[PDB]
Target: Adenosine receptor A2a,Soluble cytochrome b562
Amino acid sequence: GAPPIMGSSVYITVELAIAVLAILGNVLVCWAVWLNSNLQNVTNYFVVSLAAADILVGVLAIPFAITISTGFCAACHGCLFIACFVLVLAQSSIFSLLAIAIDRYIAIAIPLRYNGLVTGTRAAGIIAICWVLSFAIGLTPMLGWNNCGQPKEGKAHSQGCGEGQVACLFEDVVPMNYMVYFNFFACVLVPLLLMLGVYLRIFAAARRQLADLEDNWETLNDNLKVIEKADNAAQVKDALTKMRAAALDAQKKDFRHGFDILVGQIDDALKLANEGKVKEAQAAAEQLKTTRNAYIQKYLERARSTLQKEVHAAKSAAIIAGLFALCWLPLHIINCFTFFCPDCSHAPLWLMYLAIVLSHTNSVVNPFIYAYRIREFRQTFRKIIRSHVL
Ligand SMILES: CCn1c(=O)c2c(nc(/C=C\c3ccc(OC)c(O)c3)n2C)n(CC)c1=O
Ligand SMILES: CCCCCCCC/C=C\CCCCCCCC(=O)O
Ligand code: NA
Model:
């Protein structure tokens, strides 16, 4: 049996190395939001509420993890705070993720009423409510759902613990039924499943909007080409009416003239054919071709350009929410095993160290996703390096 101090120096070093990277990267995000006003919006106010949770991980949660690793003697309730504080920071992070997904869903689904729903002051109050709920969910064991009533007297005397003190160990103070049913299934697994469902509606609604533009465009141009080889005066009344319903369906100030000019030329062709004049109406329809291929077609590509921009942000936020579940599921399934298969042997200590270290890594990857995926966060970052390194 090798001395345990050697088998722990690499653990403390990895925990301290991750803590330093968690404090620097996330503070840099909070510094860019305060500096650039373009980064000040409802979406990023939830990013700061998440970066603040990642900062406190490397400031308090990681020092708490190194402390409990020793099993030091302390009051049973004082040990509960050191063991369950990371649950508070993990709860608000889930709330920030679920809040960002809802905000992006409103932007793509209801863009006309987005400015009326979300507000700088309405989002700030949601953050405060989420932080209060995260303390309630995270500190549930301190309200009596703990193992203080049945302390392990054999280990208390072993660490030389005084009267009333116990060996601060997570599995000995936090019940497993709380970690698996109340924390994992209810407060972690269920919220993540909703995030998966909200993101499916976002990408599906975006695809539906793209299909309308192409379908509304197909109904526009292909219907006008029908009248170029027409037969009766009513045969063009159908095709011009098909383009009229598609002109308004696609309209849903640079295009304000563009549609008013094109729809006006359309109505000046129904009546021209409403009187039997088929050849005179087709001549007025070539005037639509200029409008179609000059003053309106730029809108269908600008609207298509904005949709692709908005979806790109939905992927960037979904990548972050996906990386959160990846870093936290291994720890939760280990608990599931210890709780569901008692005949099984408990997971070895070296695997417990990998699951905990992996769960702390989540507090480091988020500042990297903002840069590599958001252009404005990159440039604001770079201005901080240039205006600080010198
Ligand atoms: C809520 C997240 N969480 C756990 O899930 C958890 C846990 N500790 C255990 C099991 C024991 C353990 C683990 C590592 C050790 O040395 C470093 C050790 O000596 C014992 N678990 C299961 N902790 C970290 C203290 C925790 O905060
Ligand atoms: C950037 C990292 C900031 C945190 C640095 C501090 C890390 C260590 C924190 C407290 C360790 C727990 C204190 C326990 C007292 C000694 C235990 C013992 O001697 O048996
Ligand atoms: Na986190």
User: Anything to note?
Assistant: Residues 112 and 132 are 32 Å apart (CA to CA). Residues 176-227 form the longest helix (52 residues).
